[PDB]
Write an enzyme that holds these catalytic residues in place. Structure first.
Site, mmCIF file in Angstrom:
data_model
loop_
_atom_site.group_PDB
_atom_site.id
_atom_site.type_symbol
_atom_site.label_atom_id
_atom_site.label_comp_id
_atom_site.label_asym_id
_atom_site.label_seq_id
_atom_site.Cartn_x
_atom_site.Cartn_y
_atom_site.Cartn_z
ATOM 1 N N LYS A 259 0.746 -1.237 0.000
ATOM 2 C CA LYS A 259 0.000 0.000 0.000
ATOM 3 C C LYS A 259 0.789 1.308 0.000
ATOM 4 O O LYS A 259 1.998 1.355 0.156
ATOM 5 C CB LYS A 259 -0.939 0.031 1.196
ATOM 6 C CG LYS A 259 -1.929 -1.115 1.167
ATOM 7 C CD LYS A 259 -2.903 -1.008 2.337
ATOM 8 C CE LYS A 259 -3.874 -2.191 2.412
ATOM 9 N NZ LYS A 259 -4.813 -2.207 1.311
ATOM 10 N N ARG A 333 -9.854 -12.307 0.533
ATOM 11 C CA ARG A 333 -10.362 -13.354 -0.334
ATOM 12 C C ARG A 333 -9.773 -14.720 0.114
ATOM 13 O O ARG A 333 -10.509 -15.702 0.221
ATOM 14 C CB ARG A 333 -9.974 -13.133 -1.828
ATOM 15 C CG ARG A 333 -9.534 -11.786 -2.451
ATOM 16 C CD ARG A 333 -10.532 -10.625 -2.823
ATOM 17 N NE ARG A 333 -10.043 -9.240 -2.542
ATOM 18 C CZ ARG A 333 -9.630 -8.741 -1.309
ATOM 19 N NH1 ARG A 333 -9.548 -9.403 -0.142
ATOM 20 N NH2 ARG A 333 -9.228 -7.481 -1.214
HETATM 21 MG MG LIG Z 1 -5.967 -5.796 1.374
#
Ligand SMILES: [Mg+2]
Ligand SMILES: [Mg+2]
Ligand SMILES: [Zn+2]
Ligand SMILES: [Zn+2]
Lengths: 481, 162, 481
Positions: A259, A333
């Site tokens: 990120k 996920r």
């Molecule tokens: Mg993530």
């Protein structure tokens, strides 16, 4: 001694008071009514005016606008609205008593004992704990005594949400995969003794062949903990349960697929999946609802390291399917491919999983409603009606083969964590989770838009919002009744 | 060629610096018995004063393996060889000077240097060609960590240059 | 002479043929059936096999998979499915006849005359016109004669979509604000003579006090044209209409708030709002439906220049409200503030506006469904049921005060073109348009996700998709009946 939150509505002949308010007026001999005239305009919804010294024992009487008396289910806004009014109006009121540094306050029922309570409490919450500089801890009891069972339903429902809000909000150096479990277990057991907890460690998860959740954890040196909640509400134990699953990345830095520094400190609430549903069970056990529910939440962290999950990696979920791990930030996920597979073991009735999965959801609806995909219209209905009541909206989102298709074509493997294209973000991701679900009543709830509040919901202060916990609670109440 | 394609293609969690060597050695020896392999470890590379290859490996916890292939095609052994060298980063994340998430899953084929030339020798030994060839390929990975290679760092290659 | 597309389904005892297919088999004496065995496996849906010389007059008999015989309304996928099968299966078939350079083809009814036609036609479309290198222009007539009224409904419905696809697709140097109007008018009048067109110029728009649409046009030197369509279907003229509005930026470069070079050549289809709804009326007039409909579409372009719309600009929409123009790329919002205001003049029943408004919509659902916001559940139902039939899905999206709130607080003015935050993109933008709408049956249809196709819809080739034109057509058919 203490303050008091009174309510009033809009015009008829002269804007009517809530009966607590009417009563308190007669009591100071009309002079509350009287000063209201003298003070300024009338108080439309959520607005607030503070009248000192009307009462001996109540220095501060704040009067707040309740909007329309007969304000109700709104066809457009998809909620009850009086409730929505009352929530912001006593929230508004209680934050005035708290700024007047008045440690205790008494509160107008406002015709909906429950709503004024979920306002007073949601309204007052902060997460003060790490500042030495904290606001007064004001105590909010009901005004009156006629309707106590529903105001406590308020304080209950609002608290279980506030739980999640402190579980999300706390830095992921403190609130770890273990300390989250420690508090939950503690909260579930103080809720009822008809409860078992299992803070299962790496060995057990290794044993469970939860390849995918494990692949995720291995970046950090902080331990994975797959958590198991239980509440045996049912008279006959053997009623098969409702199972809640929830993603619990305590910190998400993206991992190797790392990120941007722009506001990454909010990823301390990428365990909001785990927190929300956990608070819901803690709450359904305080309500002690005639249903067996099972909390399931893989707690672990996403970090970069010499042994972090790499781009291109095929890993094996419990169920036999392989996953190309093309983007290390699509990791809910994977944590969820496995606890979803484990959910079926329990022979559930409903498998509601919940998670702060995609920023795309945030781009989608963005704090209005918590997007929910589900192969069950029945189930959709159920979450939605509950959301009408509570006001924490939910919006159905598509679970179409269209989307599966993109996730399913895969160079190396059986499933890919990110789909073929940029478009349709939450749907692609929900399409990935259905590959790990064969049950007829599954529900993905992507909570990435309701992760935060600023001003959007009135009665929540700025910071982790803890949504949609009460709609989840309210659903299991109604499913139990 | 298809060899290299499966050696490149396979995820770098499976096809490691060791498993690449394992398959190659296996492929070279099933190609001809006129072959020796040396999956030399960190100790030997340390010993070789291969400061520069080593500086790279140290990001990952996955082991460096400097690989040595041999095929003795020549009738007279002592014919000096043809030497193939090949880079074998099994995974390249850039390290501290870290890549974008956009299609980084292709760096599982940053060991294509090592794979191509290795497949060529595996093949020249199946053809059993009258030449001695030597495969040389430093297999290791680029990752960020508490001990990863930093920007600004002077390291020493075998030959004395920094 | 020519080719033939036959269909077959899955197993029973031996996979059944569609009766055209059965018939053609008996005709070559079983030897179609016979070679199918000899050829390979069976043909699951959308798959295709080509058998030469079975027939004298039909060199190429392509047989295509139709999936399940009794395949129907799918609760999850939200559509009729046999139709969806047939559409991709004859599309698949027709693109095989076109690659065999066979200029004419005869096509199996496949039990749904309409669907095989919308497949054969949508399926075959390209926009060949500017390449000298073009594929054969294959002619697709029905096979048989029993059911001709619905196959022509196919060819009709598919063509009106193909219209939009060529209107979107063509470069915005050719397909201008005028040339779009020229073709539409031409298409509407060749549809029925019960039609009037008004390619109103700058002077009239100036006259209309359409400050906001005008502010947008002024970047380009290419002229604004506000277009007015009319179809007087109703027996009594005075029935008030259904009004379609549609955004018609022929080219969107973002303006001063300028786009990235990455795939900006698709903004030639930022007039898809205008194109879709226009094709729908062209089509409702070919069907000659007992309803008066009114096309309204501000055609103009977004460019940067010495007189382009600047960031910070307050402009005045027709209705008196001012708009801070904070981002020159949020410009459909302004072109549409005015044609929405003009829609009310017509005393409509339904105001369906449609536009390629936000990339956020694309992030949302992304080519699955065309997101639709509407203050009318009635209206929502209506578009959705139509979408079940046609297969061009539509997904409701929220029109909540939540979202209005963000657009409404505004430094300089009454409304801001982009809302307070990054989140909730399509909802913010739809919240802006409702500020320009007071009618009880309004519908925003954001088409930015269905602007394109690659492979997602089978029967559409790569390029502008022209969606949701048939669902719009089908809605006005059903509203007329
Ligand atoms: Mg993530
Ligand atoms: Mg734009
Ligand atoms: Zn995450
Ligand atoms: Zn635009």
């Amino acid at each position: 001694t203490k303050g008091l939150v009174l309510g009033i509505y809009s015009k008829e002949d002269e804007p009517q008071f809530t009966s607590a308010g009417e009563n308190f007026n007669k009591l100071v001999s009309g002079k509350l009514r009287e000063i209201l005239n003298i003070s300024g305009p009338p108080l439309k919804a959520g607005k607030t005016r503070t009248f000192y010294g009307l009462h001996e024992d109540f220095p501060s009487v704040v009067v707040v606008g309740l909007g329309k008396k007969t304000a109700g289910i709104d066809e457009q806004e998809n909620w009850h609205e009086g409730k929505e009014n009352i929530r912001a109006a006593v929230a508004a009121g209680c934050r005035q008593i708290q700024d007047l540094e008045i440690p205790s306050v008494e509160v107008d029922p406002c015709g909906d004992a429950q709503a004024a309570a979920e306002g007073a409490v949601l309204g007052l919450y902060e997460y003060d704990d790490l500042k030495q500089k904290r606001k007064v801890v004001v105590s909010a009891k009901l005004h009156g005594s006629e309707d106590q069972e529903a105001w406590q339903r308020g304080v209950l429902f609002a608290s279980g949400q506030n739980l999640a809000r402190r579980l999300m909000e706390t830095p992921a150096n403190e609130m770890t995969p273990t300390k989250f479990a420690e508090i939950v277990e503690e909260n579930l057991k103080s809720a009822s003794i008809k409860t078992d907890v299992f803070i299962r460690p790496k060995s057990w998860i290794e044993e469970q062949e939860m390849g995918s959740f494990l692949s995720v954890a291995k970046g950090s040196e902080e331990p994975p903990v797959f958590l198991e909640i239980h509440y045996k509400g049912s008279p006959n134990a053997s009623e098969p349960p409702l199972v809640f699953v929830g993603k619990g990345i305590t910190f998400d830095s993206g991992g190797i697929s790392i990120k941007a520094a722009a506001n990454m400190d909010l990823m301390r609430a990428d365990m909001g999946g785990a927190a929300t549903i956990c608070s819901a069970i803690v709450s359904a056990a305080k309500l002690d609802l005639p249903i067996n529910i099972v909390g399931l939440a893989p707690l672990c962290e996403n970090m970069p390291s010499g042994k972090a999950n790499k781009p291109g990696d095929v890993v094996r979920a419990r169920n036999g399917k392989t996953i190309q791990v093309d983007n290390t930030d699509a990791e809910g996920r994977l944590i969820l491919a496995d606890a979803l597979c484990y959910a079926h073991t329990f022979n559930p009735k409903v498998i509601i999983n919940a998670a702060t999965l995609t920023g795309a959801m945030d781009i989608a609806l963005g704090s209005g409603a918590t997007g929910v995909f589900t192969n069950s219209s029945w189930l959709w209905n159920k979450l939605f009606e509950a959301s009408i009541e509570t006001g924490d909206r939910v919006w159905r989102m598509p679970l179409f083969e269209h989307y599966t298709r993109q996730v399913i074509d895969c160079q190396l493997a059986d499933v890919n964590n990110i789909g073929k294209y940029r478009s349709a973000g939450a749907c692609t991701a929900a399409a990935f989770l259905k590959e790990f679900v064969t049950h007829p009543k599954w529900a993905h709830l992507d909570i990435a838009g309701v992760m935060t509040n600023k001003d959007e919901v009135p009665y929540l202060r700025k910071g982790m919002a803890g949504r949609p916990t009460r709609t989840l609670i309210e659903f299991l109440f109604r499913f139990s009744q």
